[PDB]
Design a protein around this ligand. Sequence first.
Ligand SMILES: O=[P-]([O-])[O-]
Length: 576
Amino acid sequence: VTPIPLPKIDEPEEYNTNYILFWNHVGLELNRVTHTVGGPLTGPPLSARALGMLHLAIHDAYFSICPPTDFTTFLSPDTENAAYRLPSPNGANDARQAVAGAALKMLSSLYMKPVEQPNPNPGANISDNAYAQLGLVLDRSVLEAPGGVDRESASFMFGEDVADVFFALLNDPRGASQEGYHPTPGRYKFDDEPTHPVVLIPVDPNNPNGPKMPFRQYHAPFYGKTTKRFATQSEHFLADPPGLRSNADETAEYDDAVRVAIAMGGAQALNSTKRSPWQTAQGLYWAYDGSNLIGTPPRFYNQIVRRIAVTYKKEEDLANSEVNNADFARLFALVDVACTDAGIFSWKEKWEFEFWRPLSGVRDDGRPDHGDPFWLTLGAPATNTNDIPFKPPFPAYPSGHATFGGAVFQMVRRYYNGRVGTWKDDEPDNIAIDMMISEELNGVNRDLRQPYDPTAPIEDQPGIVRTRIVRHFDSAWELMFENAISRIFLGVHWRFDAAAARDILIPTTTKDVYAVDNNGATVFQNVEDIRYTTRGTREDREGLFPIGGVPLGIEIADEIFNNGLKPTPPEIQPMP
Ligand SMILES: O=[P-]([O-])[O-]
């Protein structure tokens, strides 16, 4: 087992002298490694879930040893229901070791090879190498942990017991299963993406150079409807997308969404592409579409939140401050739980509606004055591989990115309001950051000329290097907005997958048709002016519902925070 050479992270080394940030970092390393080797917990919703689980375990371990005043542990040690009962410390008094035990046990439980009975799903089998690569990440982390790991300490053992409770309660090992799901083709209907209709996978994952079999992937079609939610207190729902159900009559909106999709999301060289070079950069910056050495969007959102956390920390000392430890333990629990539930509800809605992606909608439109049967997108970047850009293997509405960003950045806003500045709950903040680099645009990662070599550093492999782009942002509101519209620029989402067009685009005197510049490129409202307020109807449910991923994530974050981070009541979990 030759270890994957992981490239340098653009972050100050001082961050990992904090033990809360250190274990977050280990979680992110496992995220990017698992997406390089084909391990467990791949894909956006489940990778979010792993981080939520990590940070809940860290949170309750830490706050058992260091009791907070403004909130409580997520689980109570006094609960009668065994499944929800937090272990007691019984003399254990070392928070650093409690956190190490919780983090290590949780991450080992999540990423280790399952023992006996051969727990492996046919078509979703994981190689021995993949588990070994992840094991090495964990082993290396033990030696790097600031202040060390003492496995014999009572506090460490207490942390492990905390992890065991959370793992038993919240793990969903087969949550991403696709057994029995099949597309139902037709107008507006999700189906195999035409540039990647089938993939060849090894018959035996431990013989990768051996015989192959075709596979049609559908990412987690049952997860949203069946999995246990973390901290939400209701079910969340979106308006019918234009073209479907109660909004089947929104023809002007749908037709203009097609026009905008072509102009803003097409391949670089197409005569019909009106996107600017800067908008390409905005598209790629936020991608993290499961690529080698990069992982999934929750990894990027955590990288950003680490910078926010250190920028706005209350004490200078990252190593020896209980104020900083408590601050980070609480923030990352709030953020990664919100990211988890955002994954659940975005997936639930995605598979409820089964709305097609722009590539298929544009190609299969069927009307000469609207469609283009030969259109190509900029696409989800296939970074650190020789593969062509793609369409993520799940339905369009709402965008996962949009929802995750809504939840993560609204949570950051609720947490820091009063501290960094003051704003109304739904208005722009001043949580600015600088020197923020995306691994999609870092001067190191690349579009390779040949298949990725997992035994060599990325810099030693021929390819076209991604330009290094160092960013500043004014606010979490800006982060949330740009993250959402990035997907329009890639051509992987409709405008309404992000938010109501009315809330992000500039209107004209024609209803549902939005402004373009002299070249036909879409104009956006200024960040300071953006309000996610525009609602729509549902065929199956009375009332007014948000449109697209951003307001879905916002509402999830607000509900979680308003309830002080407490578990979803057992009685409202899915049962069926
Ligand atoms: O759901 P999406 O942002 O590819």
